[PDB]
């Protein structure tokens, strides 16, 4: 008859279970550590060449080659050390919203308003970047994609689902359902066996790639979650929402830990990324600014104010040497 | 470092040749598999119109991609779940969005039980009756037109404009007007 009341009492069960295991907030314990101080990061490189606004970027495993996807219909592979363009990939669909650099460096992926994650080969036998595969099957715009390996890749789309793809066959191996809003971003765990997703329902879900079930669901945000990033230890993650607030969740705790917010910030968060150690929490904002947050004290540690438009994407290298920030001004800035 | 510089020079010359034809192209968004493309040419001016296909009804996220387009063609079925109020709410949300406050909108408009302000409404002097038009139908047409223009005018923040019409040359002239206004604004003249 009415199974919604059972769902509400199960919600009460879950909520009082989380409240029973809440002794002290992360702020109440992180006091013996010294403050991180004023983080003064300066612009080192300004990669020019993109024509339209840049929507996404992804560092390579070498921390030198980075791919950038701008809505002008181009995927430019930059050499951050020399500012040289290694590859310029013209796309069939100019409305790209995400891009992924494979950990092997042999392939690259991108997607957007077209419900297709196109895989481009970079190690051909003749010297030309060609389309190796075009993964189709989604019913919404491609918001984020991340390579599992040279043959597997996970995708998130606006159809409130996520999918695990087999590149060689072009088939969906696993489909992840459960979200009620447009999935905006995903973050692979360091083991690539789990991944979190951020949708437009102020919710975050922890997925199992081999099992295909929703393990945990995290609430606490008030608006659409626009960005998600795993902690370097794989036992926590941060989320960026439209409510002008970043929040840090823990997996084994199943509860929100920290709330990063200030009174003067009334603009939503677009991108989020941790440092190599997770001490600093880099987050891009709707205003033409990037705020550095102390993950253990929730105090703003520094500001990056080089971009002239909204920071659309944020990326930290694997070795934590530099930070790349893409904005709608068709420019990429490498900070250090 | 030598092959890097040569490949960089090649890529940059290709990017300039692409930039010319990119900035020499008009981009348009049509509202009303994931995306359909339509390219046409008017007076040798390149147009690139995009139609939304196979997308969910929640547009507050993917509509942000069209902030740099020349104009958003907003088609309304002006000819019952009160479709016109829903179209009005959609145009209102588009007009006050912080990312589309500079993007112009080309309004294409293809009894007083849902708008009681229709009885006391008066046909203004700006309303020119088309030839072969009865007073009541023209009054209703301009009534929906001014219902849209009141939302269009109740916002001082933004560079955008609204071009209502009751078909390719109309879009061409509106895009040319938008380009002229943007050039005048870049010179701080308008």
């Amino acid at each position, epitope marked *: 008859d009415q199974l919604r009341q059972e769902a509400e009492q199960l919600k009460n069960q879950i909520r009082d279970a989380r409240k029973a295991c809440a002794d002290a907030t992360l702020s109440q314990i992180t006091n013996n550590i010294d403050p991180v101080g004023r983080i003064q990061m300066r612009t080192r490189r300004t990669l020019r060449g993109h024509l339209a606004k840049i929507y996404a970027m992804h560092w390579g495993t070498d921390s030198r080659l980075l791919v950038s996807a701008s809505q002008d219909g181009k995927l430019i592979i930059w050499d951050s050390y020399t500012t040289n363009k290694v590859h310029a990939i013209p796309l069939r669909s100019s409305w790209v919203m995400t891009c992924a650099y494979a950990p092997s460096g042999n392939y690259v992926a991108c997607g957007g308003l077209d419900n297709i994650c196109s895989i481009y080969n970079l190690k051909t036998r003749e010297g030309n970047v060609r389309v190796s595969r075009e993964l189709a099957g989604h019913t919404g715009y491609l918001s984020c994609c991340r390579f599992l390996d040279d043959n597997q890749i996970v995708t998130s789309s606006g159809d409130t689902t996520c999918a695990l793809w087999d590149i060689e066959t072009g088939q969906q191996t696993t489909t992840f359902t459960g979200h*009620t809003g447009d999935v905006m971003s995903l973050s692979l765990a360091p083991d690539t066996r789990l991944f979190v997703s951020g949708a*437009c329902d102020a*919710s975050a879900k922890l997925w199992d790639v081999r099992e295909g079930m929703c393990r945990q669901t995290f609430t606490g945000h008030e608006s659409d979650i626009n960005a998600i990033c795993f902690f370097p230890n794989g036992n926590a993650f941060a989320t960026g929402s439209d409510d002008a607030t970043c929040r840090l969740f823990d997996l084994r705790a199943d509860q929100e830990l920290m709330t990063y917010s200030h009174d003067n910030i009334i603009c939503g968060i677009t991108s989020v990324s941790f440092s190599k150690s997770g001490r600093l929490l880099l987050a891009g904002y709707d205003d033409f600014n990037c705020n550095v947050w102390d993950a253990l004290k929730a105090d703003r540690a520094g500001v990056l104010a080089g971009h002239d438009n909204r920071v659309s994407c944020l990326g930290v290298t694997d070795d934590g040497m530099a930070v790349a920030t893409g904005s709608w001004d068709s420019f990429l800035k490498i900070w250090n | 470092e030598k092959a890097q510089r040569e490949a960089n020079k090649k890529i940059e010359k290709q990017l300039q040749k692409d930039k010319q034809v990119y900035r020499a192209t008009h981009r348009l968004l049509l509202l009303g598999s994931g995306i359909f493309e339509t390219k046409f040419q008017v007076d040798k001016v390149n147009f690139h119109m995009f139609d939304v296909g196979a997308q969910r009804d929640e547009r507050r996220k993917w509509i942000q991609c069209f902030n740099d387009v020349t104009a958003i063609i907003f088609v309304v079925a002006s000819s019952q779940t009160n479709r016109l109020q829903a179209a009005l709410k959609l145009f209102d*949300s588009i007009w006050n969005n912080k990312w589309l406050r500079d993007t112009s909108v080309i309004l294409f408009l293809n009894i007083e039980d849902y708008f009681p302000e229709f009885a006391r409404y008066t046909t203004p002097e700006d309303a020119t009756p088309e030839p072969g038009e009865d007073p009541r139908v023209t009054r209703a047409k301009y009534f929906i037109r001014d219902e849209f223009l009141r939302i269009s005018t109740a916002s001082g923040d933004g560079r955008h404009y609204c071009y209502p019409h009751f078909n390719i040359r109309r879009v061409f002239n509106d895009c040319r007007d938008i380009i002229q206004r943007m050039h005048l604004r870049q010179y701080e003249l308008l």
Partner: nanobody
Framework: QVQLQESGGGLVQPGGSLRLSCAAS????????MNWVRQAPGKGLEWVSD????????SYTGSVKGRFTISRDNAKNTLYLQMNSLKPEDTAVYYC?????????????????????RGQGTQVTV
């Protein structure tokens, strides 16, 4: 956790008068815009009324303006809809909608399907 659970609603006489209460929780009620949406049987979602954060900017749909009254009490985080002079066409499931963008004039996707930040609705038969 946004719940937005609504109270009130029921079978009433034609031309009667009731009021619906929209209990808000899990978000700052003073920072978000509120909306009233209904879904009559066999029809789609329809926008009824809304009210800004301050409570001054007020807009109804034409079929209910002058008849219904939108109001909010930011102290108790509740939204009111004083229903007056009801008609059999008002029979619908009235939902309390809250678009997710705070401090914004644009208010998106409140009348959308599969849309969160909306209550389960209360049947108002008339």
């Amino acid at each position: 956790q946004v719940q937005l659970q609504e109270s009130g609603g029921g079978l009433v006489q034609p031309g009667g008068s009731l009021r619906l209460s929209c209990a808000a929780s899990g978000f700052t009620f003073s920072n978000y815009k509120m909306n009233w949406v209904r879904q009559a049987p066999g029809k789609g979602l329809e926008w009824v009324s809304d009210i800004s954060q301050s409570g001054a900017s007020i807009s109804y749909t034409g079929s209910v303006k002058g008849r219904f009254t939108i109001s909010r009490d930011n102290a108790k985080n509740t939204l009111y809809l004083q229903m007056n002079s009801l008609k059999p066409e008002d029979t619908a499931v009235y939902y309390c909608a809250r678009c997710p963008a705070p401090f914004t004039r644009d208010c998106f996707d409140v009348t959308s399907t599969t849309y969160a930040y909306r209550g389960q609705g209360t049947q108002v038969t008339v």
